[PDB]
Amino acid sequence: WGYDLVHSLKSPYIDSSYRERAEVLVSEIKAMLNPAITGDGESMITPSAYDTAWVARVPAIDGSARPQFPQTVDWILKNQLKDGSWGIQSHFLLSDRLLATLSCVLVLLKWNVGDLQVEQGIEFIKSNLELVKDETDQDSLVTDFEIIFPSLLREAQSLRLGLPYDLPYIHLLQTKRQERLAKLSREEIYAVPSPLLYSLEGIQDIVEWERIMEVQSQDGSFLSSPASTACVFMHTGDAKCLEFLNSVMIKFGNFVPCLYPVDLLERLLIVDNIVRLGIYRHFEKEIKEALDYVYRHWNERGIGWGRLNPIADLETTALGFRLLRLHRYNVSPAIFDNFKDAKFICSTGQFNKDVASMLNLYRASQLAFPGENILDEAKSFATKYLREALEKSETSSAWNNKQNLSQEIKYALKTSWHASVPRVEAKRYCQVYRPDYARIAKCVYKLPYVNNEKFLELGKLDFNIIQSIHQEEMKNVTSWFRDSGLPLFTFARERPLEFYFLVAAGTYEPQYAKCRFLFTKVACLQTVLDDMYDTYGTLDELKLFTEAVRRWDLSFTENLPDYMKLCYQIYYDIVHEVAWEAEKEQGRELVSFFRKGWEDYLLGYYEEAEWLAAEYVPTLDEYIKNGITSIGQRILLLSGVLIMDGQLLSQEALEKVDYPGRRVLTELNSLISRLADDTKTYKALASSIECYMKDHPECTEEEALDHIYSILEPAVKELTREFLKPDDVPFACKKMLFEETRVTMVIFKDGDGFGVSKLEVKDHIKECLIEPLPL
Template sequence: MASSLGVIQALIKKLKETLVVKVIENPSSFVSPSAYDTAWLAMIGNPNENYEKPMFTSCSEWILSNQMDEGFWGERDCHGNPTIDSLPSTLACIIALKMWDIGHEHIEKGMLDLAWRTGLRVMLADDIKEVVAHIYDQQRLIFKMEELVNKYHYPPLLSYLEALPSSYQINQATIINNLSADGSLFQSSAATAAAYIAAGNPATLSYLHNLVRACRHGVPSIYPIDEDCIKLYMVNQLQRLGLSDHFHDEIAVLSKDIYSNTIDDGIMMWPRLQEWIKREILVTWMARMDHLDHRKWIEANQDSPLWLGKASYYRISCLNNIDLLRLAKENFEYRQMVYKKELTELIRWSKDWGLMDMGFAREKTTYCYFAIASSASFPYESDVRLIVAKSAVLITIVDDFFDTKGSLDELQTIAKAVQRWDNKGLTSHSKILFDILDNFVGELAKTYHDQHQIDITTSLRNLWYEAIDSWLIEATWRKTGHIPSMSSYLEIGKISVAAHVMVLQASYFLTPTFYPHNINPSQYEAITKLLMKSCRLLNDIQGYEV
């Protein structure tokens, strides 16, 4: 276990010093390049070389260095095959290379017109020609129906300037009038490259130079990148992988300005998106278990998250960083190891005290621990988890004793015994339950006293007596046939659900610690009262539905 913790701590240190700090300082560097858009910048000739060489040599060099073994450029699908979007990317790269005499012929049916204009001849099989003709018909229909720039459609047709056929006449004034303040055409790298080729606008050239300087290893589909968006995705990734406990300060820095800025309308695509949407709809927020959600998110991130681009999906590499995913797995597995160890201890404690063999009570030892461990985020080795789990087991069994086993006389006797905290006069199950409770409260009080030199014994006893007294009142109502008013029922019911018993006594052992006066029934904080009422109402709703 110690070696696993060492691996986790080393990965945390490494990621803080490399990945996370880089996301904070230069988030744009994690956006993957687009072969399609890089090819369009590579098509621009250098006027200082009589247009015989590319202006942006880094782009043509990127194309030469990033062709897949099979001869295409672009993305692979989950089976390792080129995606449909790799076709325009490949064709654009080949056109760029052919312009400078360094390419091989490839075909992409959507850009035949452009290919033919550059001298690339594409041979089609007869059965494909019909399909291509149909595509051209659909293309002409789109051009008739849509305007170049329409306020009701974004991105507009003009943002695909580089792909529009020569028959679609666009004058330079239209291009220049629609340039953004930064000189781009709708922040599209490819469309802006085509705009410069068509109009030669200095502002457009300045934008392209800035783009290449910022993205030295291939350009993205959109520039500038919404860096706040990338930071937000990173925060989301850390939280959903179950790593937020290790990156508190970094998340605070990443989040600092995110919510004060406008986030772009780019579309982030996650693998198995429909599966996630279905889960989000079916599993209510109150029923979520963080640890299980972390596992599902880790499994989903075996595939990379994608951001929807023009001719391809492009990736934000920091989100599926190998070390980040390794840390998430190590962290999850280490927590699992800790949880198994704690569950073994809880079962041992329950068996030693005979709680699993009471006969009348629900056996909920594993259930109680599962509910606590999977939904509460505490440090690895946390006594708090076991305190809450043991409390839940005790509450379940004592509540069942008051509901189903004890006579009214027995219940009154044990309630009085708890009030004076003395087991005299108790027998059978009543004595066993009191002795377990006495031992549990004694251990908690001793541990707290050893840590803080404060005696909380009386506070803990009063907390448990309050719960037991509420169970006695409800048992009396039930056994005598009394129907309380709604206000009386809720006043007692918010105590009998005993959520505050689990939470308040465990809060002593959190950092910063709780103070004894905070669990005095007459001085409960508003948030404690809301917790009690909410849990009672949720419990009743669930019971009614069942």
Template structure:
């Protein structure tokens, strides 16, 4: 069961630093009654999560010295940026070359510098191709068409799955002859931009492409570059991956290509290292606590409540000061709703109750805390705050939030359930499914994984609808999608929070936030 962690960072503002401070141990007396001193009372001790000590501390973060903070590095980066901008505007590039350049910019983490240019290019493609009704009728066009389909859908353009009808006919009639594995990988990646109505993408294209890629990986090949790309795609599709982490992987992958664009890779590496500095500065702020009044607080629950109460009021006061709207009632309700779901889980555990999957998920998508995270994001980072949107968020009526939270919950369940059940916790989604249907553990895990796939289809649909009809900002929608991506990353190899070494969390944090990318 999720809980408040005493050593977590307050992630809103900088607080006073106390490097030598260590939090004392507390006994949870929140469920005991106040009795006279001469009466024995059973103290309810909280079950231990047995989490490993954090490998990070504030002094370590303060000691990081990044040489890319120098102004000369920023100037060099900006000069390279203008060279790349000229590449985007070059009229001599073919459709395929433009699409591959946009894809490289995105995967290298530098597309944010060229959002207007990229959007204009994609809009031009969309209009030229009849607003998404063109057909891919040649296998040699498959890579470019798949790439264009994925990029257009990622950027909110309507493109029909019918563009692959000719290819689908060849797949179903077993006359598809292409052995270009790069085209198959592009087709596979495109299939993950499906929505609930895209039956052909989900049931024909994705299984076919996956089978072909696996066949390639299992076979003999001397092209290690493409084999690594194929294995990476099978592990997790690009659309599901945490963007910054994927950028770090792609920097190495792109650098090893036989046709590496030296300007592009140098720009991307410099930009990564410069952005890393900003992340390091943020970490220095969020890793400190204000503990001035700690000695005055005698009890574990009172401490948690008071810290949270003060923090929410501080956030609310700042927002009221700068945006003239009182968000404190909405933030308080989000925490109350979260704690109520914890209480439901505690009651289930105490009674030995085994809910069905549907009943479990009605509570669990809120108890994973994604709605609480996202309403705070909306309040803090929105340029304009709408009471109407706050109400829909507070009442859990935003589907994009539910979808993001569902993926976070299911990914968490798959990654943590074994350890959490061992120390004593409520059943997770897979165990609920097993109890409800009699399925095996393997079948239950496959069912939960399919639930994740289906929810991604919903996210893709809700993202498209939000960009067209919703009052939600693009930034909020991206935050909701990125929260889902983060969860797929956090629990990809197990419990990335409880067992960070085994789940590669420490390795990933070091590569993203501590170690700069070496330049050529």
């Protein structure tokens, strides 16, 4: 550890060639995404054999005995898999293969072609249905499988196809279809758009086609489904239905996907993945262009996966809310009212979609601003939902196990967005992100703009490069520390890497080396000062030191005890080094501002030292007043935020994020730090807990701890709003302040009074700064 460990590190990723390579990857990714965000190559999604077979059913509008879209028949004939099924070869899902295969078999029979394909397809369906022994063998179900498959299978039965219609599993599916259809408000199908519109081809005996046009999408589709639209067309001859089918054929050529368009969801998924991989800083232009498009279509009623959906989609809406707010767009959590029954109700469609919607709702709820009760309500509901989902058999299907769904849900629930280490979350996501991830709707599908090898290649390389740069900085840090004189204060533990981690895990960009270096120096100094005032120093010694603090005179130190003479000299040097660097970056005088900051901090320590000497227990009000100042976060934060390469802070701009006595970023960070610290420790003078109990002699320790949290929770919401709020403060500065708070909140998370885990701190340093990602 310390000097020896850090100087033993020899990372290859520091060489310029690695960054040059990453820049090639960045250019390649910009070119890849260009059609999606700026061109007309939006909605890149794999073929749906199931839907393609429905489109193939449509007879020629000229009345001749052939398909209107004969290229779809040719596609089907040429794309059977080796086992006789149709679907995506890389991923096997039973329900997907069963549905697509029966769909293709029937249309080939309709047109009296592909006799060999039909024979092989029928064998696949029969063969595989007979392997289903019980419910737990069925695996994950494609959208509305229970509704559609019995219907499609009855079509086959009327043609007397050699399939096992009398299997228990078949009877069970009909039972499930009945239980789904029982909750159906049929009269409302025609009046209120609903998820069932995605699958009209499965409920043909129920739908009055003469009334169904009222809920058609503006593009002519029925909830973006080619199959459902093809069905309505064949029953109605509706011109707009045909226009939709034509538009999809024009786009894809000789097949159709199971959803179209997916313009909103795809854009959001692209952004979400780029952000989670930690590579977002390379794609500011593309992220803005993507989210600007989503925002244009953002409305009070929510959004669907495609901009023309006549009903909103919780998955896409919750994802949109979070990403838009995170990128400083003005959105309101009142959009979630669109998904309440009159509270929430999502849990009706297919399982992966429902789980995804709730994961997204859970994540969105954590970005709550003050007074947003609906998001507190959303958090509760989603948490309960996800905990229940963990106990469901569907969660442990072969398909879900292969994708580690249970693990993903568990990780989400144990993870607080506020109490996260940003660099570590990106590192962890690089280990979970799948270039070949397969999604489920009417069929299994992929979105190559979202899931691809280039994203991951860049994610791993970029992480390693940044880390190697930090490793060189840590050599500088430990080298400085060794020669600084600070190690002479043997009453204080040496922790330079812990303090470097506090800033570097959130403010990681290469250009902010000076910020990280100066922040670390000040944090090292402060830990000595803290131990001196609250432990080592006598009140009479501290009175002397505090007088020297007022004087700003090196010559005055002749009065101090030897250890204080040295301490004062180091303190004086660090303060003025930071100030010179700040003045250089900011182009204005800042020595006076820094000096006032330091004296307020240390005068705060001295007040505390007087209390200790007198065994005085403050009121909670006086404790918090003192604590916001004496905790030292304000002056530490200032020692980094004013020296960020290229980030100009006028006095006016600075006062927006730093202003003692006001609820701005540095003040809220100070309050959060003080109180989070207390909740985590305090059990291991007097803390906020103990002060509250003096104020309330009859209250229990339990009530006391609850009270401290009642102060913390609102503070965290304010911190979030202050961070994300639109203003003219350089965003890099606000992010630096916010990210230091997030890393602090990690150190103090799950406050039970027990104390901070030293082994976990070391583990965070190992993961973040020491161990690279394997390439």
